[PDB]
Amino acid sequence: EARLEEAVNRWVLKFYFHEALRAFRGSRYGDFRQIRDIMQALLVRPLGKEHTVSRLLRVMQCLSRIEEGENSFDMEAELTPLESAINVLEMIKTEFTLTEAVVESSRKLVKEAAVIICIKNKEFEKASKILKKHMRNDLLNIIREKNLAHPVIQNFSYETFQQKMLRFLESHLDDAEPYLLTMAKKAL
Amino acid sequence: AGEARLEEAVNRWVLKFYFHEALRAFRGSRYGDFRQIRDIMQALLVRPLGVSRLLRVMQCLSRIEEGENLSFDMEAELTPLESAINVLEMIKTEFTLTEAVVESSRKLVKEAAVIICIKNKEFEKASKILKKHMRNDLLNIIREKNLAHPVIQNFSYETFQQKMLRFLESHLDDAEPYLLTMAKKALK
Ligand SMILES: [Mg+2]
Numbered sequence: 305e306a307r308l309e310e311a312v313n314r315w316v317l318k319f320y321f322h323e324a325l326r327a328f329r330g331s332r333y334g335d336f337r338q339i340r341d342i343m344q345a346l347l348v349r350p351l352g353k354e355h356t357v358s359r360l361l362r363v364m365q366c367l368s369r370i371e372e373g374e375n376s377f378d379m380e381a382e383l384t385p386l387e388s389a390i391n392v393l394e395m396i397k398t399e400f401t402l403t404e405a406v407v408e409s410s411r412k413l414v415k416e417a418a419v420i421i422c423i424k425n426k427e428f429e430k431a432s433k434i435l436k437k438h439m440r441n442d443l444l445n446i447i448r449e450k451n452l453a454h455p456v457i458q459n460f461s462y463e464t465f466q467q468k469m470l471r472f473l474e475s476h477l478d479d480a481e482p483y484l485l486t487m488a489k490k491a492l
Numbered sequence: 493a494g495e496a497r498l499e500e501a502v503n504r505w506v507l508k509f510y511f512h513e514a515l516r517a518f519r520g521s522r523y524g525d526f527r528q529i530r531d532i533m534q535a536l537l538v539r540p541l542g543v544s545r546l547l548r549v550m551q552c553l554s555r556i557e558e559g560e561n562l563s564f565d566m567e568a569e570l571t572p573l574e575s576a577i578n579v580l581e582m583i584k585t586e587f588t589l590t591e592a593v594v595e596s597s598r599k600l601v602k603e604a605a606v607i608i609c610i611k612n613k614e615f616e617k618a619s620k621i622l623k624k625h626m627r628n629d630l631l632n633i634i635r636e637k638n639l640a641h642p643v644i645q646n647f648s649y650e651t652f653q654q655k656m657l658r659f660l661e662s663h664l665d666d667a668e669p670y671l672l673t674m675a676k677k678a679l680k
Contacts, residue, residue, distance in 0.1 A: 358564075365566050365569060368566060377537045377547045379530065379547070379550055379554055388569060391569045395569060
């Protein structure tokens with residue numbers, strides 16, 4: 305019945321959450337995107353309403369922004385993915401009940417990546433707005449660098465950045481294996 | 493080469509014509525037409541265009557138009573009106589408007605943002621929005637914020653939308669789009 309479907313929906317969501325984290329960790333972003341679309345479709349169905357599915361959903365949301373943050377005028381999004389990731393991080397802190405101290409480093413990381421990635425994609429205009437808006441020795445360099453100079457520290461790695469954010473997010477998640485994976489292994 | 497320049501010239505006329513019709517639809521509360529015209533414009537924006545103001549207005553109008561709409565949206569952390577707040581700031585900045593000119597409209601959006609969340613069962617978001625963007629009315633909402641909307645928490649979204657359009661419209665050019673002028677001449 306309804307309760308049965310809801311129970312399975314929760315199982316399914318948690319399994320895919322697990323597999324998406326695995327794909328992201330192994331840098332299989334294509335698989336992460338596909339698995340995330342499945343979870344996106346399942347969210348319309350009734351789930352364990354109150355369940356901690358919400359924490360799981362914020363994480364997926366944060367990872368989605370980061371995964372696309374490296375990429376015409378979009379009438380549907382004023383913010384660049386990473387600027388949006390900043391908002392999500394504030395929601396994770398508030399929802400996971402994290403102290404400002406445990407989140408501070410990640411924040412600054414997302415903020416720096418937000419400006420730098422825009423510079424690398426050659427959009428100093430947006431890099432400027434973001435730089436001015438968010439976030440002092442680095443600021444100067446970036447501003448000066450905003451004068452169109454890439455060979456200056458603008459040589460960071462988005463991969464290294466993504467993986468570091470994933471570890472931050474994982475450090476606040478349970479380590480439990482999804483019931484479906486458990487059954488899959490037992491089915492041999 | 494010359495063909496590409498001609499196509500760009502037409503794309504601009506088309507974009508401006510539909511912008512004019514989008515505003516007309518919005519002004520006449522024909523939001524269905526607004527959405528359809530807006531989708532035409534979105535498809536146009538990917539093509540070579542040989543304005544940025546026209547873009548921000550459509551963006552702002554788009555968030556407002558969907559401000560009352562109803563699961564977990566993994567694509568957007570912010571409610572439409574929260575996003576409208578950002579767009580309006582970009583408009584103030586990009587349109588070089590004084591704070592005295594934007595202040596009134598800014599409060600309207602913020603107020604609608606909380607009231608709309610209240611009109612839904614989203615009391616937490618309501619409180620979250622208020623404690624972030626926003627003295628009596630502020631207290632009145634904090635007070636109302638408790639499963640009881642009949643206390644003023646029953647305003648007019650239609651009035652809100654038209655006031656916003658009027659404000660946005662006050663900073664635009666009144667000239668008719670070239671295509672509309674040609675259409676009128678076609679009847680003569
Ligand atoms: Mg009317």
